Design a protein around this ligand. Structure first.
Ligand SMILES: *[C@@H]1O[C@H](CO)[C@@H](O[C@@H]2O[C@H](CO)[C@@H](O)[C@H](O[C@@H]3O[C@H](CO)[C@@H](O)[C@H](O)[C@H]3NC(C)=O)[C@H]2NC(C)=O)[C@H](O)[C@H]1NC(C)=O
Ligand SMILES: *[C@@H]1O[C@H](CO)[C@@H](O[C@@H]2O[C@H](CO)[C@@H](O)[C@H](O[C@@H]3O[C@H](CO)[C@@H](O)[C@H](O)[C@H]3NC(C)=O)[C@H]2NC(C)=O)[C@H](O)[C@H]1NC(C)=O
Ligand SMILES: *[C@@H]1O[C@H](CO)[C@@H](O[C@@H]2O[C@H](CO)[C@@H](O[C@@H]3O[C@H](CO)[C@@H](O)[C@H](O)[C@H]3NC(C)=O)[C@H](O)[C@H]2NC(C)=O)[C@H](O)[C@H]1NC(C)=O
Ligand SMILES: *[C@@H]1O[C@H](CO)[C@@H](O[C@@H]2O[C@H](CO)[C@@H](O[C@@H]3O[C@H](CO)[C@@H](O)[C@H](O)[C@H]3NC(C)=O)[C@H](O)[C@H]2NC(C)=O)[C@H](O)[C@H]1NC(C)=O
Ligand SMILES: O=C1[C@H](CC[C@H](O)c2ccc(F)cc2)[C@@H](c2ccc(O)cc2)N1c1ccc(F)cc1
Ligand SMILES: *[C@@H]1O[C@H](CO)[C@@H](O)[C@H](O[C@@H]2O[C@H](CO)[C@@H](O)[C@H](O)[C@H]2NC(C)=O)[C@H]1NC(C)=O
Ligand SMILES: CC(C)CCC[C@@H](C)[C@H]1CC[C@H]2[C@@H]3CC=C4C[C@@H](O)CC[C@]4(C)[C@H]3CC[C@]12C
Ligand SMILES: CC(C)CCC[C@@H](C)[C@H]1CC[C@H]2[C@@H]3CC=C4C[C@@H](O)CC[C@]4(C)[C@H]3CC[C@]12C
Ligand SMILES: CC(C)CCC[C@@H](C)[C@H]1CC[C@H]2[C@@H]3CC=C4C[C@@H](O)CC[C@]4(C)[C@H]3CC[C@]12C
Ligand SMILES: CC(C)CCC[C@@H](C)[C@H]1CC[C@H]2[C@@H]3CC=C4C[C@@H](O)CC[C@]4(C)[C@H]3CC[C@]12C
Ligand SMILES: *[C@@H]1O[C@H](CO)[C@@H](O)[C@H](O)[C@H]1NC(C)=O
Ligand SMILES: *[C@@H]1O[C@H](CO)[C@@H](O)[C@H](O)[C@H]1NC(C)=O
Ligand SMILES: *[C@@H]1O[C@H](CO)[C@@H](O)[C@H](O)[C@H]1NC(C)=O
Ligand SMILES: *[C@@H]1O[C@H](CO)[C@@H](O)[C@H](O)[C@H]1NC(C)=O
Ligand SMILES: *[C@@H]1O[C@H](CO)[C@@H](O)[C@H](O)[C@H]1NC(C)=O
Length: 897
């Protein structure tokens, strides 16, 4: 008899608390201030976007490997222009004939872009470190000269670097004759040539200009122009400007002083946008922007949510004290984790009370209603009266605040750190609410000494409980179940990137141009783990692509997967370094040795010419030349220090200077192979591209481990900058369904174990909760709400919350001792359904009056838009179905003396 013992215990507890209310109130209000001091002490928040990745997941372990061996990924800042007013026209270029250009490639706009680019290059900002005024050379990603980066060696990708940013070279007209000349060649004839082959040093036109940038590296067309899918390289609808800044770990001061340059870059481009509006639509984005704009919306709406926990006060209209009790409990639970050490963000800190308070106030309302509705046996004071009232309401009030702490704690197994912190914070707020609304609230309820609901509940009852009503409500809700369980399959898993922003930020314009005008997605690298030999003649051929090497190979596998971009999510070949290194070892003035030079007997660089150096590295021509082992360690570092000029453009440190990590002897440890994704638009494309690249990587490693000298536990994994975000969605269906399905067991095993309910009433309770979950999943899929990590903690919270909808109804039916089932549930409805309705409306009205006007996309889609569905879909299953279903398959009469 576990139910009877709890009532006796809580009745004696309530009588003693009524006896000593002042002392219990002071001694239970004093241990809240100590826990609340943890908030004011530090409460360290987590600003950046590394609160959305599992700290030991495989996708972040690969990032920790790559970041260690090759340095971190470069931060990118972009500007897109896309002039829409001008008209496409015609140009009869002498080489390729007719070409019908677009309006953005007119010469009147390129100069105006150049005067913005060369002024963004010379930008200086004052830092918190007051000594040094920061230039761009300190924090720029220079792939050719990192030792002392001059200001002209920083990576500034744009179309203007086909002319090396030279104004006079851009304004150049040259006579050229093929005997049918009829014109002079202008800059566009040179741009059309450089688009086809970016590696050329001497242009094939009459005017000669290299297609290489100011820093000695080629610039590809997809990094410069976009929106050119048909009619290639002629009808670009948008220019592109890109600045690359090298990234550091979070503790380094250079990252602190490189986020201050991007702020001035944004504040200068925002002035550039309004300086000209009749000829451009410039949209920009810095890497600082996204992680410091989703915090702005959350930090600009705390006063607009302060009406939430004051509109909690007005709906009860002894009530101020209860809301103060729940707010103190939630604040203490919020501040307790600072002592243990948990870096929670302000976004987590803003929505915790507005989901715990909606469950913490209903128990107060139920207790005060049962205290003010009791028969009030005379001959005894209130000191036993409140204990007598609390004895038969304590266990039912204990189920609904213990079947939510269990649900929230069980829901804290999600991979995301911030969702885990939100679950852990609200899992202890409610459990520190139930312990503090009897040790403090009962003292106030004894210390206070010094309608119409039951009107129309008895008219709402004849609307139900009749065969007109009891035979249509059942099949209608079963049809709702039948439509929801087949609409569940249309649900879409994945969280879009644009839902973190408001409806008015410039990043929405940037993403709308990025999804529509780019032609290559983010780059990806096929990293090679430690172990591969890379030296044997039978070792290079498995990673080769040309001149005698094998039929199928790694850099041949990537190129073959490029040709079906719809299935494999790649759009550019691999560009391996062994393929370029074998080309560089070909003779004729690339790799040469001094013969009679005692002082420089090893290397003759390409730029030096004389009659001294004449011997080649590779000895004699032969079919499919490949170096020996001893010729590898000599000749590989030299290839990583030969800048490409026009005497040997075969390769060098232009693109491979940080793609191989040499040891202290000459055995390579790891490598990278850079290939570009196809244009990825929504969040169902990122995860699918991740899976379709990872399976290709596993195919490559399974093919590559067959060589003789290799080592097992050697895998070639893919890595891109956003792999650490969308890696969870491969495995959120099995780990999401399992967490929900295991979450019903501790509620079913306790709701039928606390208050009667042997099998049938608890079974109907489980049927109601499963119906609520399937209906809310179907309506969530039908609205457009996604199914991600942040939209699963809400469903777990609804599973915890629905015990409110059902437990009091099944309680009042079980205690009912009236004769027939046709009217036995009427007393239970009139007794408890009104109180449950008031409790549900207690979350319904403040659940809509604040979170529906949040102005953030995250709160407006995942907390107002979804909690409203659960709240007004649990009313229909708790006030229209459950009493009706209990009148047909309801248990027989319990005496229950
Ligand atoms: C870092 O930033 C500081 C401040 O912008 C900059 O100092 C600049 O020095 C030059 C040369 O003096 C000027 O642009 C200017 O210094 C003087 O400023 C006064 C007050 O407006 C002017 O009346 C003077 O014309 C001018 N110098 C003289 C006497 O001709 C100052 N910046 C401004 C415009 O206030 C540094 O150059 C930057 N980098 C560092 C630390 O070198
Ligand atoms: C990568 O793969 C190469 C080729 O298989 C391998 O080179 C091998 O090194 C071992 C250890 O020194 C050598 O034993 C082996 O052949 C040796 O080559 C010298 C050259 O003058 C001969 O004089 C030796 O007799 C002979 N073996 C000895 C030392 O007695 C050599 N393979 C050949 C035939 O070139 C590398 O070790 C592999 N590297 C890694 C990272 O495992
Ligand atoms: C090519 O590979 C090299 C070897 O893996 C890299 O050099 C390694 O850089 C690591 C940091 O990126 C270092 O790790 C830190 O080393 C210090 C000194 O021993 C330790 O105290 C730290 O615990 C450790 N990690 C930190 C910072 O917590 C390695 O020490 C260092 N070499 C090794 C493995 O000993 C190169 O960075 C990489 N490419 C180049 C040349 O940049
Ligand atoms: C943008 O393009 C300009 C045009 O190419 C560059 O200016 C050119 O620089 C060349 C190298 O200094 C000049 O050659 C020199 O010209 C002078 C004066 O005519 C002669 O005395 C020299 O003999 C000759 N060089 C040598 C070493 O013999 C070109 O004359 C000059 N272009 C013209 C026609 O004015 C700019 O340098 C370039 N901008 C940048 C950033 O470099
Ligand atoms: O920042 C952030 C968001 C998480 C912040 C925090 O973890 C949270 C959120 C809600 C809670 F209840 C409790 C904690 C998240 C994001 C979440 C919802 C969205 O509609 C959009 C983005 N994202 C992101 C950022 C970049 C990106 F590439 C993909 C996603
Ligand atoms: C290209 O063609 C010839 C090749 O020598 C060259 O003379 C042109 O320059 C002259 O410019 C004149 C003024 O625009 C033009 O009318 C004339 O056709 C042309 N030379 C003559 C007399 O035929 C070169 N074109 C230009 C405009 O520089
Ligand atoms: C003569 C007797 C009654 C004196 C001893 C009374 C002791 C056992 C009582 C009096 C007040 C009580 C406290 C009142 C309030 C709280 C806050 C609650 O969140 C945890 C328990 C805690 C901290 C209680 C612990 C037990 C307590 C200290
Ligand atoms: C070193 C720095 C970060 C220390 C300063 C930490 C600051 C930002 C902390 C300390 C106390 C915090 C407050 C503590 C309590 C609450 C109530 C909660 O319902 C909303 C957030 C709010 C209002 C917090 C906002 C952030 C806050 C002001
Ligand atoms: C790096 C170190 C310091 C991290 C320590 C934090 C982690 C590992 C541990 C330390 C103490 C732990 C807490 C101890 C007690 C409780 C109360 C329980 O009802 C729910 C879990 C909860 C809230 C634990 C959560 C995990 C926790 C916060
Ligand atoms: C073509 C697409 C984009 C049109 C979408 C129209 C939107 C506004 C529609 C589609 C589905 C609709 C929902 C369908 C079901 C319910 C349950 C009901 O108890 C409250 C209203 C609510 C929650 C609806 C609100 C409006 C709604 C969200
Ligand atoms: C393409 O070129 C032809 C001939 O110059 C021209 O008539 C046509 O208008 C051009 N294309 C577009 C989209 O206008
Ligand atoms: C600055 O750059 C030049 C470029 O050659 C280099 O020689 C010099 O060593 C660098 N300065 C220092 C102090 O290293
Ligand atoms: C130029 O383009 C802007 C932006 O679309 C537009 O508002 C403006 O009317 C255009 N002006 C003209 C007439 O070219
Ligand atoms: C595959 O290798 C065989 C044997 O070297 C060769 O005959 C064949 O041409 C290669 N495959 C293709 C598609 O050429
Ligand atoms: C690579 O891919 C194809 C199709 O996925 C697969 O059938 C084949 O077995 C894989 N190659 C290897 C070496 O297993």
């Amino acid at each position: 008899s576990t139910h009877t013992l709890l009532g006796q215990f809580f009745q004696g507890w309530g009588t003693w608390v009524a006896s000593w209310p002042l002392t219990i109130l002071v001694l239970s209000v004093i241990p809240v201030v100590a826990l609340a001091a943890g908030l004011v002490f530090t409460e360290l928040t987590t600003d950046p976007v590394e609160l959305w990745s599992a700290p030991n997941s495989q996708a972040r372990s690969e990032k920790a490997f790559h970041d260690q061996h090759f340095g971190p990924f470069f931060r990118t800042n972009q500007v897109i222009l896309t002039a829409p007013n001008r008209s496409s026209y015609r140009y009869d270029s002498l080489l390729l004939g007719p070409k019908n250009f677009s309006g953005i490639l007119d010469l009147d706009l390129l100069l105006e872009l150049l005067e913005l680019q060369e002024r963004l290059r010379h930008l200086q900002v004052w830092s918190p470190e007051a000594q040094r005024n920061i230039s761009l050379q300190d924090i720029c990603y220079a792939p050719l000269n990192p030792d002392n980066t001059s200001l002209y060696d920083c990576c500034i990708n744009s179309l203007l670097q086909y002319f090396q940013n030279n104004r006079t070279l851009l304004l150049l007209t040259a006579n050229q004759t093929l005997m049918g000349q009829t014109s002079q060649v202008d800059w566009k004839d040179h741009f059309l040539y450089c688009a086809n082959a970016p590696l050329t040093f001497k242009d094939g036109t009459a005017l000669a200009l290299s297609c290489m940038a100011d820093y000695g590296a080629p610039v590809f067309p997809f990094l410069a122009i976009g929106g050119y899918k048909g009619k290639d390289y002629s009808e670009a609808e948008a220019l592109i400007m890109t600045f690359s800044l090298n990234n550091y770990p979070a503790g380094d001061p250079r990252l602190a002083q490189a986020k201050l340059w991007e702020e001035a870059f944004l504040e200068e481009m925002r002035a550039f946008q309004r300086r000209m509006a009749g000829m451009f639509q410039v949209t920009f984005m810095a890497e600082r922007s996204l992680e410091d704009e989703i915090n702005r919306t959350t930090a600009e709406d705390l006063p607009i949510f302060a009406t939430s926990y004051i509109v909690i006060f007005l709906y009860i209209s002894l009530g101020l004290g209860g809301v103060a009790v729940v707010l103190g409990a939630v604040m203490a639970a919020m501040g307790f984790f600072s002592y243990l050490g948990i870096r929670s963000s302000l976004v987590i800190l803003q929505v915790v009370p507005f989901l715990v308070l909606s469950v913490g106030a209903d128990n107060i309302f139920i207790f005060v209603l049962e205290y003010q509705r009791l028969p009030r046996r005379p001959g005894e004071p209130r000191e036993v009266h409140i204990g007598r009232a609390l004895g038969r309401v304590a266990p039912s009030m204990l189920l609904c605040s213990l079947s939510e702490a269990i649900c929230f704690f069980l829901g804290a197994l999600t991979p995301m750190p911030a969702v885990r912190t939100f679950a852990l914070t609200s899992g202890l707020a409610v459990i520190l609410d139930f312990l503090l609304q009897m040790s403090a609230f009962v003292a106030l309820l004894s210390l206070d000494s010094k309608l119409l609901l039951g009107f129309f509940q008895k008219a709402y009852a004849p609307f139900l409980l009749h065969w007109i009503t009891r035979g249509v409500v059942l099949l209608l809700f079963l049809a709702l179940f039948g439509v929801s369980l087949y609409s569940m399959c249309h649900i879409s898993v994945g969280l879009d990137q644009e839902l973190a922003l408001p409806k008015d930020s410039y990043l929405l314009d940037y993403f709308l141009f990025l999804n529509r005008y780019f032609e290559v997605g983010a780059p990806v690298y096929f990293v090679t783990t430690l172990g591969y030999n890379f030296s044997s003649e039978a070792g290079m051929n498995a990673i080769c692509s040309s001149a005698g090497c094998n039929n199928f190979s790694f850099t041949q596998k990537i190129q073959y997967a490029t040709e079906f971009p719809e299935q494999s999510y790649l759009a550019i070949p691999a560009s391996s370094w062994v393929d370029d290194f074998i080309d560089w070892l070909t003779p004729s003035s690339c790799c040469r040795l001094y013969i009679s030079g005692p002082n420089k007997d090893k290397f003759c660089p390409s730029t030096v010419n004389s009659l001294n150096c004449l011997k080649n590295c590779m000895s004699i021509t032969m079919g499919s030349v490949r170096p020996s082992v001893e010729q590898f360690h000599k000749y590989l570092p030299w290839f990583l220090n030969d800048r490409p000029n026009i005497k040997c453009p075969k390769g060098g440190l232009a693109a491979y200077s940080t793609s191989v990590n040499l040891t202290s002897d000459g055995q390579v440890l790891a490598s990278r192979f850079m290939a570009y994704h196809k244009p990825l638009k929504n969040s169902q494309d990122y995860t699918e591209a991740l899976r379709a690249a990872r399976e290709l990587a596993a195919n490559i490693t399974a093919d590559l481990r067959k060589v003789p000298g290799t080592d097992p536990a050697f895998e070639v994994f893919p890595y891109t900058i956003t792999n650490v975000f969308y890696e969870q969605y491969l495995t959120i269906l099995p780990e999401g369904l399992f967490m929900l399905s295991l979450c019903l067991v501790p509620t079913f095993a306790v709701s039928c174990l606390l208050l009667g309910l042997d099998l049938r009433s608890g079974l109907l309770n489980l049927l109601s909760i499963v119906m609520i979950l399937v209906d809310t999943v179907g309506f969530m899929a039908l609205w457009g709400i996604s199914y991600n990590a942040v939209s699963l903690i809400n469903l777990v919270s609804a599973v915890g919350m629905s015990v409110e909808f059902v437990s009091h109804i099944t309680r009042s039916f079980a205690i009912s001792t009236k004769p027939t089932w046709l009217e036995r549930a009427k007393e239970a409805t009139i007794s408890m359904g009104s109180a449950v309705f008031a409790g549900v409306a207690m979350t319904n009205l403040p659940g809509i009056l604040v979170l529906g006007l949040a102005k953030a996309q995250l709160i407006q889609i995942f907390f107002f838009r979804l909690n409203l569905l659960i709240t007004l879909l649990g009313l229909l299953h708790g006030l229209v179905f459950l009493p009706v279903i209990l009148s047909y398959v309801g248990p027989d009469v319990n005496p229950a003396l």
